[PDB]
Amino acid sequence: AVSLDRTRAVFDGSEKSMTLDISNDNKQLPYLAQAWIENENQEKIITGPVIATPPVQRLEPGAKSMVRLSTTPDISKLPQDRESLFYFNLREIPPRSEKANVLQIALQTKIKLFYRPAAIKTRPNEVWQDQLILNKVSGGYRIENPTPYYVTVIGLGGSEKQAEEGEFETVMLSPRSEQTVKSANYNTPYLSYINDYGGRPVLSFICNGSRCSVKK
Amino acid sequence: HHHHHHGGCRPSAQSLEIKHGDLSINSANNHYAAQTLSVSCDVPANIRFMLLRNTTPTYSHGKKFSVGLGHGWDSIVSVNGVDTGETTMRWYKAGTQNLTIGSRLYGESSKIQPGVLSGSATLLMILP
């Protein structure tokens, strides 16, 4: 009933706060919307350094509203040359119900919330994911993410179509890290990743020996 | 329309209320009811759907996910025909797909009891 406007949130550290739009799409009933923040380990955090307000609000039938995200002074203690990971959670609370013998289901949504410090602020539609490097390893690839951003890889195949529709175990690489991924060997690897907007561009890689980099 | 600023998925707006009717002319244990919702995505997507138990079950159902409905009764809650508490749906392109939540009543006889049934679960959508 209560929908969220995005599949991930990027908090620009240049700002003190931002808002996420939510909508009660149900035109007959009011719903409460609970919002809260979890840290990179999925611990619920209530006193910062990122907070969501209000924790609960009521949305009348059809109403739109917002959740405000803001930072506490202790946000300064986070690294300032790379993103930090949080999760934004939205849970709806439906009313009643006053009917006998019912199972009631409430929807909850959990999305990634990337704290992006001011120093690594990005231009709109900037692309850093083409900086990924693929290492050929026994049974797959070790993907290096040298960027200061979390990178979510959702596809890896030998063709563009296979990068998009092939079966792949999603992996998110932390800033300046590397992770080994299971895969068939590909002569010309294609990789799909999720950008700030929530879309999935595809990148074409070229290999030399054990190392593949984005075809330039 | 300013490039909707963000790609999103939105579930169907209807109240998720799985109704088992009057349990009087069938007053049943293996009783089944369901609710289908849809989810519309602007972008490709994976969504991992995970049922969260709110009200605790009276019986143990092993690896089947359940919720207590009160008195002697439990519901085994399925999602897209899976009793195990989790499913993932995938969108290669923008579009909408259905997700069906099913409820199958379970009650013993020893533990049973006469009154009205009421239960709740949370369907958690985890987006990568």
Side-chain angles (χ1 to χ4, degrees), chain A residues 20-75:
Chain A
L20 304 185
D21 292 345
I22 61 178
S23 166
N24 181 3
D25 300 316
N26 190 299
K27 308 208 165 320
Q28 290 78 227
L29 293 170
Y31 276 73
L32 312 181
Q34 303 187 112
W36 69 92
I37 301 288
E38 295 172 359
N39 64 11
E40 57 176 352
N41 296 139
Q42 305 191 31
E43 301 173 285
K44 184 178 164 160
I45 52 164
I46 186 41
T47 66
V50 179
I51 73 155
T53 58
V56 187
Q57 64 185 107
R58 170 179 161 121
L59 297 158
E60 303 302 327
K64 286 87 157 45
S65 189
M66 75 196 77
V67 175
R68 173 162 268 95
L69 307 182
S70 46
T71 54
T72 70
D74 282 9
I75 197 77

Side-chain angles (χ1 to χ4, degrees), chain A residues 146-165:
Chain A
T147 80
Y149 309 101
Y150 286 82
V151 181
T152 308
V153 177
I154 41 74
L156 182 55
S159 71
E160 182 172 287
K161 177 192 172 82
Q162 179 171 191
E164 301 187 302
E165 305 179 349

Side-chain angles (χ1 to χ4, degrees), chain B residues 52-114:
Chain B
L52 270 30
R53 156 190 300 161
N54 291 351
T55 47
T56 296
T58 293
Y59 317 99
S60 83
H61 307 270
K63 67 212 162 193
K64 296 189 165 305
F65 178 90
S66 72
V67 155
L69 264 31
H71 306 306
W73 298 97
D74 281 356
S75 184
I76 286 89
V77 190
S78 49
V79 290
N80 281 349
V82 175
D83 289 344
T84 262
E86 200 192 310
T87 199
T88 297
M89 294 195 289
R90 172 158 184 202
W91 286 250
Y92 303 137
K93 151 177 68 163
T96 109
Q97 311 184 27
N98 288 344
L99 168 84
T100 301
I101 307 157
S103 176
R104 202 184 97 213
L105 301 191
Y106 178 98
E108 223 105 88
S109 175
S110 344
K111 288 86 136 40
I112 289 295
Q113 264 173 337

Side-chain angles (χ1 to χ4, degrees), chain A residues 131-206:
Chain A
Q131 294 175 32
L132 287 177
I133 287 158
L134 270 33
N135 298 81
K136 226 296 130 198
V137 297
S138 28
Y141 292 92
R142 191 185 54 254
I143 315 184
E144 307 173 5
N145 170 210
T147 80
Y149 309 101
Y150 286 82
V151 181
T152 308
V153 177
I154 41 74
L156 182 55
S159 71
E160 182 172 287
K161 177 192 172 82
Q162 179 171 191
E164 301 187 302
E165 305 179 349
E167 188 60 31
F168 184 79
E169 195 173 304
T170 297
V171 54
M172 179 173 60
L173 299 101
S174 297
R176 295 192 292 269
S177 62
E178 65 183 23
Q179 198 158 357
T180 282
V181 129
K182 279 170 174 69
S183 182
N185 171 266
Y186 299 120
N187 225 101
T188 56
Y190 287 82
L191 182 146
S192 185
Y193 66 86
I194 314 181
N195 59 28
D196 285 9
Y197 174 92
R200 319 191 159 187
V202 185
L203 294 164
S204 176
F205 284 73
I206 297 205

Side-chain angles (χ1 to χ4, degrees), chain A residues 89-104:
Chain A
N89 298 82
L90 184 74
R91 174 159 58 204
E92 65 186 21
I93 308 182
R96 299 92 98 275
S97 88
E98 218 176 58
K99 305 199 66 167
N101 310 318
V102 302
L103 168 62
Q104 204 152 6

Side-chain angles (χ1 to χ4, degrees), chain A residues 101, chain B residues 20-29 31 73 105 117:
Chain A
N101 310 318
Chain B
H20 286 275
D22 318 323
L23 299 184
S24 56
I25 83 94
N26 43 264
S27 166
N29 134 92
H31 191 84
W73 298 97
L105 301 191
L117 296 180

Side-chain angles (χ1 to χ4, degrees), chain A residues 7-8 85 87 110-112 114 151-154 170-172 193-195 198 200, chain B residues 9 44-48 88-89 125-128:
Chain A
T7 73
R8 67 244 299 103
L85 183 61
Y87 296 87
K110 193 203 225 61
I111 66 166
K112 297 163 182 175
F114 303 107
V151 181
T152 308
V153 177
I154 41 74
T170 297
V171 54
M172 179 173 60
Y193 66 86
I194 314 181
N195 59 28
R200 319 191 159 187
Chain B
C9 295
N46 297 22
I47 301 175
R48 179 172 179 216
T88 297
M89 294 195 289
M125 296 178 285
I126 309 164
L127 288 66

